[PDB]
From a paper:
To obtain stable inactive FSHR proteins for cryo-EM structure determination, a small molecular antagonist, compound 2427, was added during FSHR expression and purification. Through numerous data collection, we were able to obtain a structure of wild type FSHR in the inactive state at a global resolution of 6.01 Å. The EM map was sufficient to place the receptor ECD and TMD, while the density of compound 24 was not observed. Due to the relatively low resolution of the inactive FSHR map, we only built a poly-alanine model for the inactive FSHR structure. In the inactive FSHR structure, the ECD conformation is closely titled toward the membrane layer and the TMD conformation is very similar to the inactive β2AR31. Structural comparison of the inactive FSHR with the inactive LHCGR and TSHR structures reveals that all three receptors have a similar ECD down conformation. The ECD of FSHR has a nearly identical position as the LHCGR ECD but a 7°–8° rotation close to the membrane layer relative to the ECD of the inactive TSHR. Interestingly, the hinge helix in the inactive FSHR structure is elongated and shows different orientation from the hinge helix in the active FSHR structure, highlighting that hinge helix plays an important role during FSHR activation. In contrast, the hinge helix in the inactive FSHR structure shows rare interactions with ECL1 by rotating approximately 30° counter-clockwise relative to the hinge helix from the active FSHR structure, thus confirming that the interactions between hinge helix and ECL1 is critical for FSHR activation.
Author numbering: 20 to 287, 344 to 643
């Protein structure tokens, strides 16, 4: 052919020279392919007479705008139809497709058509697989849209569509085998009578959709259900309706745990993701000993922080920069203890029934608040420890200047900046950067998205760098203090001892947790979720609880101040 290459009865028309369908193409051609054609409008009945045609492929039809009626008319052997890259194709003739008994595959992608093509006249005898995707212009599905597509079972691949609403009885009169509606961001709800008059679907794929709830009827024949990333699907229909449901791919491990409990009751379905120790359905704490110790630890931490703050504020002596740092550390410890007490209360309230309230707790504002509070407390404590270590190092190594030219105003400004940074970090999970609902302890373990993983890695790196800097400063201060060439003061020795104790406690509390978090972030979890929860419950608040006794209570001045206050 002059305009299209011919080989084994296959015509491959390409280039811009193809402004219209050539009428000279042999009627016996088996496959016709149009790539990067300049055709704007497809003439009606263009493919008429192509009895031997088996497959039709249209791609890169940027200039294509309209398809005339009866184009795909009276094709006995036409089994596969492919349309792609037809961005300008906004209008499709309703009667374009008709009389296709042997139709088996119909792929339409990258099309600007705002309405689904009318395939009622297809009347395909064999199974027809519909593959409609990248149809942003399509927003609604009319009733009986797929009616008359084919007599046998048909698979409707409608993923990557802009469908926002679905009318009742949309699939009525259709033998839906598998449905692929995933990637429908605008899909918010599905009518109950959507499947009325239809068969199946056997397999449903609603992953990455905003469907609030599934239809209460028509799912009896659903064998497989896919709802990955379907956050809006907080609650699913009763297991009784899904009798045929054999496999499930949801996005809420709590729902899978509830189904497992129902399976045990039935005994007295492969559902993923399976429950795990990160989000237990029995109890958040799990171990009775850990739950009992948690309340005591939280109470002790809160009492110690309150006592330290009261003593520091009521002290008659002048409030030094170290006093402000100790007050900030006590406030951070009190916040951590409050978060721990809230977690313990939540665990105790739902004892033996966490599974029922697991969804509410994880999705509730309480979990987000607890996670934000824990993150803010940890950031504030780290910043305060780093600032105290830096001030001590400047005072010791720069004995010429009291604190390397440091005053109360500078310390207050540094504390304010650290508090602002901690608040910003704690607000990140609330702003969609990762999520605290991924764990029952409200920890921001969500790293599925690149942004959340990057934020977690950055936080871990910052914590590690701060710890390393603090350790180096402490080592330098200790070396300087013991140097015989420098006459270290007794107050300097006491400050060094207190700083060493605080640094040792912080390192003991943080190093294991930091290492575990780093390992987990790299997709190499070296510890189970149950062990990690216990470690975070015990080690993390242990440092905060020991901070008062290590820093202030052990100090002679603090003891004297407490004794004076007690005399009042």
């Amino acid at each position: 052919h002059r305009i299209c290459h011919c080989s084994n009865r296959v015509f491959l028309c390409q280039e811009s020279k193809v402004t219209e369908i050539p009428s000279d193409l042999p009627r016996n051609a088996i496959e016709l392919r149009f790539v990067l054609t300049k055709l704007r409008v497809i003439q009606k009945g263009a493919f008429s007479g192509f009895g031997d045609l088996e497959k039709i492929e249209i791609s890169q039809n940027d200039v294509l705008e309209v398809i005339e009626a009866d184009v795909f008319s009276n094709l006995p052997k036409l089994h596969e139809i492919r349309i792609e890259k037809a961005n300008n194709l906004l209008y499709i003739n309703p009667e374009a497709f008709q009389n296709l008994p042997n139709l088996q595959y119909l792929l339409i992608s990258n099309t600007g058509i705002k309405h689904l093509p009318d395939v009622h006249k297809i009347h395909s005898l064999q199974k027809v697989l519909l593959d409609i995707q990248d149809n942003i212009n399509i927003h609604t599905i009319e009733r009986n849209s797929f009616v008359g597509l084919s007599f046998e079972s048909v698979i409707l691949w409608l993923n990557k569509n802009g469908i926002q609403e679905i009318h009742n009885c949309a699939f009525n009169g259709t033998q839906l085998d598998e449905l692929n509606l995933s990637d429908n961001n605008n899909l918010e709800e599905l009518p109950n009578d959507v499947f009325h008059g239809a068969s199946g679907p056997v397999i449903l794929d609603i992953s990455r959709t905003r469907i609030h709830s599934l239809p209460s009827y028509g799912l009896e024949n659903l064998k497989k259900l896919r709802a990955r990333s379907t956050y809006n699907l907080k609650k699913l229909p009763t297991l009784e309706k899904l009798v045929a449901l054999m496999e499930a791919s949801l996005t809420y491990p709590s729902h899978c745990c509830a189904f497992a409990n129902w399976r045990r009751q039935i005994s007295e379905v492969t559902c993923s993701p399976k429950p795990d120790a990160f989000n237990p359905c029995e109890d958040i704490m799990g171990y009775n000993i850990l739950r009992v110790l948690i309340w005591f630890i939280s109470i002790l931490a809160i009492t110690g922080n309150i006592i330290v703050l009261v003593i520091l504020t009521t002290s008659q002596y002048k409030l030094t920069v170290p006093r402000f740092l100790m007050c900030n550390l006590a406030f951070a410890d009190l916040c951590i203890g409050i978060y721990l007490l809230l977690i313990a209360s939540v665990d105790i309230h739902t004892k033996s029934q966490y599974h029922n309230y697991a969804i509410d707790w994880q999705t509730g504002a309480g979990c987000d608040a607890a996670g934000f509070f824990t993150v803010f407390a940890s950031e504030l404590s780290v910043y305060t420890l780093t600032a105290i270590t830096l001030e001590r190092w400047h005072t010791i190594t720069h004995a010429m200047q009291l604190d390397c030219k440091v005053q109360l105003r500078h310390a207050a400004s540094v504390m304010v900046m650290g508090w602002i940074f901690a608040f910003a970090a704690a607000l990140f999970p609330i702003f969609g950067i990762s999520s605290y609902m991924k764990v029952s302890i409200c920890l921001p373990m969500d790293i599925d998205s690149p942004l959340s993983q990057l934020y977690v890695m950055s936080l871990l790196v910052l914590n590690v760098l701060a710890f390393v800097v603090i350790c180096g400063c402490y080592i330098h201060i200790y070396l300087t203090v013991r140097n015989p060439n420098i006459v270290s003061s007794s107050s300097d020795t006491r400050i060094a001892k207190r700083m060493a104790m605080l640094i040792f406690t912080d390192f003991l509390c943080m190093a294991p947790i930091s290492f575990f978090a780093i390992s987990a972030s790299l997709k190499v979890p070296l510890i189970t979720v149950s062990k990690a929860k216990i470690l975070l419950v015990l080690f993390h608040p242990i440092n905060s609880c020991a901070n008062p006794f290590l820093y202030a209570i052990f100090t002679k001045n603090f003891r004297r101040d407490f004794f004076i206050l007690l005399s009042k």
